């Protein structure tokens, strides 16, 4: 009598022709490949500049809320409370705009499984609203950690070693939110909006590290954040956006309690040109058995997800880089172009998720790379 | 009684801390590693934007003319007539600013050679001055071709199959030069300066193709240039600059008439993420015997030289890219970041020469990649 | 027995905090200052880069269609067929993002007028859909002209001398639309998307000139467009956008058949720093009686509307400018920053509409400046 | 028996076609309009991006050192110790690249004066070298102040009310200089290079304010700098550059001890569109007797010199501006385009000096505007 599962994850990498193009998703729903009701996350690469004044993130979010609210017959607020819309801007270099759709299929009666291994589990969860004076600070850290521990448990992911990627959409500090904080008698972690994105990304990432036991609580405080880059998560991927003031989190790992045919793995890029780490992540998901991946192996890849940054020590493999003191082009623009190019050249596909700004996500100048792949 | 050589090439990849930093070169001359009198080409990657208003190209040129004129006790004009100063702007992504010094050692009495194979030959040559109405048109094509055929012969490179890289510094059309042409009763190939860079690069590249028998003269005319991308050289690398109105050419290949321990090889990148072509060029120079290069093999690499461009069909491996309709960041900026990232991740060194704009240099969206490497 | 009017225009300059901020408009409707049913045009300054990949134009359009469709209880398609959403990107320099709401109040029984003069008349009209091979060419010219003549008549604007500003939203050629045209056996006026914006703006502007008798039909053909800048309209203001393939036109002038207290006037800026033309337009609407406008006079200004461009001869008042060969910053970005700065410094308010790219709109390097002002 | 003078200043506004174009200056020397030996300052507007990676500043400096060293028969080091080469990058909007040449003619026997008034006095002076840990801090403040007080005295400028413009070239902190400071056991005022430019500009400006009695010493400390913008000089204009580690200062005012026909005046722009302050500065130098300047009056203007910045409160005349959270275009780029446009439209000439970044120079969001003009 076969083994059985109540839960199954599906993942779909969908090309987008511009920030408002929901048609690849509508096609899959129209064709019954996915059910709108089972979507839990839309993870976008939108082709704005990926920095402060990137409005394609909110544009794409709005475009998807309109589609899903009308497809599901609910309000835009409800759909927003039901699906995490996580839009990472900046599609530099060859990086192809797209979105990844995550679905969870829950069956009241179990459906039989064919292989005994663990399979992809994903669980979305939202934190409480933060006040602006909490952004970039320990209340964002610990609330995120609490949410991550909870999502793990509810997904039936056994322990932190089975978590391979935690994606967060986190707030940033606009000038208005800063004023709000001051007018109420508080300070903010920084008075520059662009810098606030790294603070928000960093604090969220350390929450993940805290939740997975990768850092000790007693080594964390406000003054560590964006400062002590010996502290980090190996699976954290955080993306700052203008819209919300809470954190939207999707935990991704493997679990025996899930059926289906997707698994996930990860490695740690030690820097932005560490293609060996890329091949190792592929290998862990059975997509690079030898030195170089084969075409069949690469056809199992659903998508690759990575974080990129300009090495803050100014160097890559003891060569000076120019990404940090370039007044025309922000460092994250450079960094995303690089890391997507490295991954694209290994998996032969520029349509992969690469998000900039990896404060406390991997080592400095590096970041996590995760692969979701089919088992056959 | 050993075989013998009159000619020997040396090549030195020198870090630069900013566009005026000649100190790495001064160090090698001060230490007697090279002789100022035997330098024939300084090939720079200067950290300006690499497009029209990139003044680091002329800055670096000026800085080197001052150093060499004073080191050689000649005027800046004479040093400029003696050394080709070929400055390719744009050091995007991880690309590390640097210059490559080429020297030719001529000995009246031959010096004995140890291995019988062909060795790196390089030969600099300048064309006549062009009028602005000749830029981007058949007189730039045929003069370049004549110069390339001559440089080959004088270098003792047996035939086109032994040429692996032809580097050109070519003019561009400023608004003043355009007016000059009109006031004299002529037209120009384009009235936009940035577009004129592709016309100048393209015409120069087809001269190289003509010289090496890669295209037929009867298939060339003005209307082909930047238009028919089925016509191209596999070894051409051309870089437009504001300074001169002639073409400065350095032909690089292998020859039995040269001693030393450097060889060169090349492959054709079919697109900007074609790392297999990169590994093939390494393999041809004995630096990638198996699937992945080893650390010893990579230590033989002196430098890698490549051309990069945004695929003009809008696509990379059937994925849409955004490089061509990005009003904030020029396509060549994107493309250089990509191709240097791909090469850097394979050879483990971001200090490599990657020049943007590959009209008629490789297939559309692609370009040549050449490696100069030590034989042991 | 007083004179009487069936028609009255209102205009409201509304600050926007970001591209999706419809709240200033919702406030005026909630308060009953305007009636949603009487809005005919939303003219936006959205804070994207104002060039090809400016997605705030469509974002803002989408945000307003959602608000109005839900306020009016119609579909987004119907609201789009009822209101012209004309979004001009690029808010450089001090230029403050905002929108201008235009309303037309029609009364079946006339309402009495107090002053006998002409008053602001505005009339929206849409052309037919264009095929991509018509963009930038005589069918866009003549269809626009037909639409302008019709809007004038239906508005009861007596003749071209009473037209002071014709605002158009016109298409641009994406790579897909170009392919469509070729696959059907046709050519396009240009194969570059950014250049296609000037072609679309130019053709639309000459339609306006044709309609108002400012150019002769026999002097127009495809080869004139973006080429012969002695041909132009003094009241045309055209803005290219990615969304539609028709032209949306709003004609603005003065008419005895309209009541209310708004008038409009215009002058022609001879170049981008022609503040005397700005003061002349103010004077024509009674807002600059002496050399310098007073605070009361400036308080009558509802908004100012202007076109800006980088002088294509490379010069402003016989000084070289750098706007055209700047690879980091598009010329229209520079030009909008300049012209808004000049106007803002004269009217003491950076919240004014300045749209880039004035092909055939005013003389080369110049453009129209119109003022809508209250009569007291 | 006439009054008499030992000292006379000349000023020449010279167009430049590119950063290396010294020919307008060579022409004036060749023609004997100026004597190379009497040049004390070359004040440039060079057409780089005016931020961190603007290499046209050093390029232009190098180009002028080569010309003058060879014209004067001295070394480049000596010419650099003899002339202040003050290169302000960024020629945005219509701003025309150019340099202003300042000369001082000293005569052992006095030359008779025709008018009794004060005339332009200018005095160059260099501070000591700073260590990087002194940049942006009180030792830069007080050394600058000492140098300013000394230059004033040696120029015979009676008191601070006769000083109208103090131009400084000040250092910035590269990553290397920061490391130097840390390795020696010290901190730096900031670890970002771009931010270090404002710290260096700010500290230098407060030195000027200290020297002229515009701020009290007891209100200054390190923590005030870039923080308390109620502290500022009304005549300070400071420009950060990569080259030196000292400050090069030129004090400009009026003095009875100077002959000639140039005077200088200044006003304080309260914000970036304060054209009334521009007209007031003109009026003080007899170039705007009525509301609007006349053509003859404007022909007396040799040049105008101003500082520009993006209002750090996010607003201009209670309108939101976008200059500070624009990741594509630095705020100083925007601000320079604006202020040069405002001045150009008033004096009818875009060739004027406008330098970005006015920390402690005028009120926040504003800056000084000075005019040097002929008396007839
Ligand atoms: Mg990291
Ligand atoms: Mg090519
Ligand atoms: Mg025009
Ligand atoms: Mg200030």
């Amino acid at each position: 009598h076969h083994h059985h599962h109540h839960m199954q994850a599906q993942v779909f990498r969908v090309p987008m022709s511009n920030p408002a193009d929901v048609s690849g998703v509508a096609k899959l729903i129209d064709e019954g490949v996915i059910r709108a009701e089972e979507v839990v996350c839309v993870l976008g690469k939108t082709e704005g500049n990926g920095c402060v004044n990137d409005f394609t993130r909110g544009y794409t979010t709005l475009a998807f809320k309109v589609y899903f609210s009308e497809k599901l017959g609910v309000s835009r607020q409800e759909v927003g409370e039901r699906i995490a819309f996580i839009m990472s801007g900046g599609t530099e270099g060859v990086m192809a705009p797209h979105c990844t759709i995550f679905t969870v299929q829950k069956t009241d009666n179990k459906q039989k499984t064919a292989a005994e291994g663990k399979r992809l589990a994903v669980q979305q969860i939202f934190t409480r609203e933060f006040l602006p004076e909490e952004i970039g600070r320990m209340p964002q850290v610990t609330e995120t950690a609490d949410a991550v521990r909870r999502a793990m448990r509810e997904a039936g992911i056994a322990d932190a070693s089975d978590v391979h990627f935690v994606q967060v959409k986190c707030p940033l500090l606009t000038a208005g939110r800063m004023h709000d904080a001051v007018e109420r008698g508080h300070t903010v972690a920084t008075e520059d909006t662009y810098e606030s994105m790294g603070y928000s990304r960093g604090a969220s990432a350390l929450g993940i590290a805290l939740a997975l036991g990768e850092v000790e609580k007693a080594n964390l405080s406000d003054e560590v954040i964006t400062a002590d880059y010996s502290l980090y998560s190996s699976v954290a991927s955080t993306s700052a956006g203008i819209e919300l003031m809470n954190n939207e989190i999707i935990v991704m790992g493997n679990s025996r309690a899930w059926g289906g045919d997707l698994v996930i793995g990860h490695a740690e890029m030690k820097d932005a040109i560490d293609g060996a780490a890329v091949r190792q992540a592929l290998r862990d998901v059975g997509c690079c058995e030898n030195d170089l991946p084969t075409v069949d192996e690469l056809g199992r890849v659903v998508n690759v997800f990575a974080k990129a940054e300009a090495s803050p020590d100014g160097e890559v493999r003891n060569r000076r880089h120019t990404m940090l003191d370039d007044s025309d082009i922000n460092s994250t623009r450079h960094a995303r172009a690089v890391v997507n190019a490295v991954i694209a050249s290994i998996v032969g596909d520029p349509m992969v998720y690469v998000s900039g700004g990896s404060e406390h996500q991997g080592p400095a100048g590096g970041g996590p790379v995760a692969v979701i792949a089919r088992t056959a």
Side-chain angles (χ1 to χ4, degrees), chain A:
Chain A
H1 310 90
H2 314 16
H3 291 4
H4 286 92
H5 80 267
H6 284 301
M7 304 295 261
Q8 186 176 137
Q10 319 173 281
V11 186
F12 298 95
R13 179 174 60 189
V14 183
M16 291 176 64
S17 69
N18 70 70
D21 174 26
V22 305
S23 70
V25 172
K27 181 201 173 55
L28 301 197
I29 285 166
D30 286 350
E31 287 181 7
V33 172
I34 67 161
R35 294 181 28 78
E37 301 82 12
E38 299 173 344
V39 172
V40 300
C41 176
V42 179
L43 184 57
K45 284 307 307 182
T46 61
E47 61 209 270
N49 70 23
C51 302
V52 176
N53 67 325
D54 180 339
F55 299 102
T56 66
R57 294 184 295 242
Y59 190 14
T60 299
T61 297
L62 175 61
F64 271 109
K65 289 198 179 157
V66 166
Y67 171 82
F68 276 102
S69 76
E70 298 181 358
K71 205 67 179 188
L72 296 173
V74 305
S75 89
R76 288 188 293 273
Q77 199 192 332
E78 302 172 69
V79 62
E81 290 160 19
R82 184 199 177 103
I83 303 168
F85 295 107
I86 302 181
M87 301 307 159
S88 165
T91 59
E92 294 90 354
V94 293
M95 173 144 52
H98 70 276
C99 71
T100 306
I101 307 296
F102 296 84
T103 69
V104 174
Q105 317 189 262
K106 299 216 206 91
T107 157
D108 173 80
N109 317 343
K110 311 170 92 182
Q111 298 302 120
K112 321 197 106 179
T113 73
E116 197 281 316
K118 314 180 186 132
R119 295 287 184 272
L120 172 69
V122 309
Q123 171 66 66
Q124 84 284 6
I125 189 160
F126 309 118
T127 71
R128 67 167 178 82
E129 281 264 291
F130 303 108
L131 299 171
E133 63 268 26
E134 294 176 310
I135 302 309
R137 286 165 170 173
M138 288 298 299
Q140 197 175 20
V141 176
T142 60
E143 287 301 308
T144 296
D146 290 347
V148 167
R149 286 188 290 253
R150 175 166 174 191
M152 260 186 80
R153 291 165 179 156
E154 266 153 12
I157 298 171
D159 51 52
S161 69
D162 287 333
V163 181
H164 298 275
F165 203 76
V166 185
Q167 177 63 54
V168 186
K169 180 202 193 182
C170 55
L172 49 67
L173 286 176
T174 60
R177 289 160 175 169
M178 300 179 174
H179 281 89
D180 171 31
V182 173
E183 284 171 351
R184 288 185 289 93
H186 305 290
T187 70
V188 291
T190 180
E191 301 190 358
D192 176 70
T193 294
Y194 170 88
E195 191 176 19
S196 86
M197 299 176 70
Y199 269 96
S200 184
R201 288 180 224 118
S204 297
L206 292 167
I208 287 159
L210 181 56
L212 306 179
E214 289 173 292
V215 300
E216 302 287 47
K217 183 147 204 202
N219 288 321
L220 304 184
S221 74
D222 290 345
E223 52 182 33
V224 128
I225 304 177
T226 70
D228 191 351
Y229 284 135
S230 67
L231 313 169
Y232 56 91
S233 172
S234 284
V235 296
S237 167
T238 63
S239 185
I242 314 145
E243 291 177 306
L244 305 198
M245 281 297 284
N246 69 346
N247 275 6
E248 313 198 320
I249 301 172
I250 172 161
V251 169
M252 305 180 190
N254 298 309
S255 175
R256 298 186 71 261
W258 291 60
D261 57 5
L262 305 184
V263 300
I264 188 171
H266 83 285
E268 192 158 66
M269 293 178 83
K270 269 136 183 183
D271 60 14
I273 57 167
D274 186 356
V278 178
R279 284 188 299 268
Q280 187 55 58
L282 290 165
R283 176 166 293 185
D284 302 346
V285 294
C287 291
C288 193
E289 191 182 38
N290 288 307
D291 281 321
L292 292 176
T294 71
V295 163
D296 177 83
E297 281 172 323
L298 291 175
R300 304 180 194 196
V301 176
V302 185
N303 211 348
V304 191
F305 311 86
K307 294 293 310 195
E309 82 184 343
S311 203
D313 66 3
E315 284 186 357
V316 178
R317 313 233 180 150
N318 293 291
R319 309 301 209 178
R320 176 172 75 90
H321 73 74
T322 66
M323 294 177 284
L324 290 175
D325 299 304
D326 187 335
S327 307
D328 306 309
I329 299 178
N330 202 268
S331 74
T332 65
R333 298 264 250 163
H334 285 289
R336 283 183 297 264
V338 168
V339 168
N340 162 283
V342 170
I343 295 163
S345 78
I346 292 170
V347 311
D349 187 341
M351 188 174 283
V352 297
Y353 175 96
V354 170
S355 162
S358 63
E359 302 89 351
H360 305 292
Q361 305 150 68
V369 60
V371 182
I372 296 180
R374 311 174 186 87
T375 47

